[PDB]
Design a protein around this ligand. Structure first.
Ligand code: MWP
Ligand code: MWP
Lengths: 264, 266
């Protein structure tokens, strides 16, 4: 992998592995999401790191508020997929990281993703707007003119997600993270929540449809000793669902989302 | 990745990923086990196989290879961003089945950082009945194996061939109600063998994991966990720290795996 010529974006190629694919012999959306995370990590390392001395001094970290992925073609087992990533400042709100996925052999865009990140105190979990001093330290690593993976003026990446009402049409209860679901800091990996959301989709939908779009909002973190319930209701050629992840006991919301599926 | 010059073994390099490491910023034993599986798959493809390593004779009789035992020893877990080189080969073990071995090395130093061995047996994919290999099938795979013995674990009467006892109730530690999600399934909708390693490790206390490093794991595979099954993971200290393990179905207590782990103080 490497930064591009202008040093404002990062590209990396990946060969799809045997254990990374589903029943269609193509990469699952969780493998794709892990690869997005990996190319994001490699981008931060290549530019010198994604926390500066100033963020480290104030105990601030970047946390994901929203993730939006659209896949036109899932790469097959043994195929090479090229992923390009970049960041852009969104004023005082936070930052946005975008991705473009391409088939390395044809050069055609097979997918795209966008994510919203906000600054949070590591210890108190309190959110805050971006200070001018912190924002100005990261601007030298972003393209200055807008560069959007989802340009469309009415794109599904910025749609507001409602809260699922009980009773849910489908459910998967008692979901718990194991050590493989944790990152190097013992926190639940963001991709695990995507897997948990998908667990409440019926197997018949998964067997006859392909996931085209997933939008996920992150409200609260699942701790290593928490238990989660995954709720889904059909809202809809295509099938659309509304999703909710909440703690098994008190019903505290951890995520909400939407998925769009197309017939195979 | 590629077959070596003699075409009797396969080598592949991997760069360790950010999501593949644990709290020590080194690859977990589950990432290592997935890489062993991946280099095994790439070896079968390189020697001509289009399912897993099944010849047309096995395909006509509906026979598949299934893991009976997995044994892994790690001296050093590769760090995040490091390149690890893995070499794999197979050997026929007469009529019993086959053995697949692996050697892990640090690509920069060339030193052996780990080794693994596994026992595979032939099974009918529909009835799940075990069978001897027979001359006709064994003779079709011999051209892909070294003829002289080549063992990742040469030592006479070593840890890889030790008999594992059945854990007696009550267990010292336990993790109950473990269930597979879609990410735990392979391309044939069966639970991936590496998930059972994760489930075994779930009943080790967090304090042991925080102060020790896993050096050895031996796992026997008795029965498969189905997509709608629920598993209990049981562990008792038998001692470094050594543990005896048992995975069984949550309800009727049917055994699915038994194993042992050996851990070294950090
Ligand atoms: N906040 C922020 C802005 C740009 C960039 C990063 C962080 S990075 O370090 O991940 C690569 C470029
Ligand atoms: N059964 C068996 C024996 C040798 C070899 C394989 C299978 S393979 O196809 O994985 C490569 C060598």
């Amino acid at each position: 992998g490497s930064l591009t010529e202008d040093g404002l974006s990062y590209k990396e190629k990946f060969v799809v592995r045997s254990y990374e694919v589903g029943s269609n012999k193509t990469a699952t959306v969780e493998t794709i999401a892990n690869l997005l995370q990996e190319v994001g990590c490699n981008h931060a390392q290549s530019v010198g790191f994604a926390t500066t001395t100033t963020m480290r001094k104030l105990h601030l970290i970047w946390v994901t508020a929203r993730m939006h992925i659209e896949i036109y073609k899932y790469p097959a087992w043994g195929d090479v997929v090229e992923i390009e990533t970049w960041c852009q400042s969104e004023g005082r709100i936070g930052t946005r990281r975008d991705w473009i996925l391409k088939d390395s052999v044809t050069g055609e865009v097979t997918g795209r993703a966008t994510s919203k990140w906000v600054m949070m105190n590591q210890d108190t979990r309190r959110l805050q707007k971006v200070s001018d001093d912190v924002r100005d330290e990261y601007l030298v690593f972003c393209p200055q003119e807008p560069r959007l993976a989802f340009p469309e003026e009415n794109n599904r990446s910025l749609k507001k997600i409602p809260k699922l009402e009980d009773p849910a049409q489908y459910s998967m209860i008692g979901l718990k993270p194991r050590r493989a679901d944790l990152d190097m800091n013992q926190h639940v990996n963001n991709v695990t929540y995507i897997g948990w959301v998908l667990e409440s989709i019926p197997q018949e939908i998964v067997d006859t449809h392909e996931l085209q779009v997933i939008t996920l909002d992150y409200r609260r973190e699942c701790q290593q000793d928490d238990v989660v319930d995954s709720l889904t209701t059909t809202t809809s050629n295509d099938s659309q669902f509304l999703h909710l992840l909440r703690l098994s006991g008190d019903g505290q919301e951890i995520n909400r989302g939407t998925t769009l599926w197309r017939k195979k």
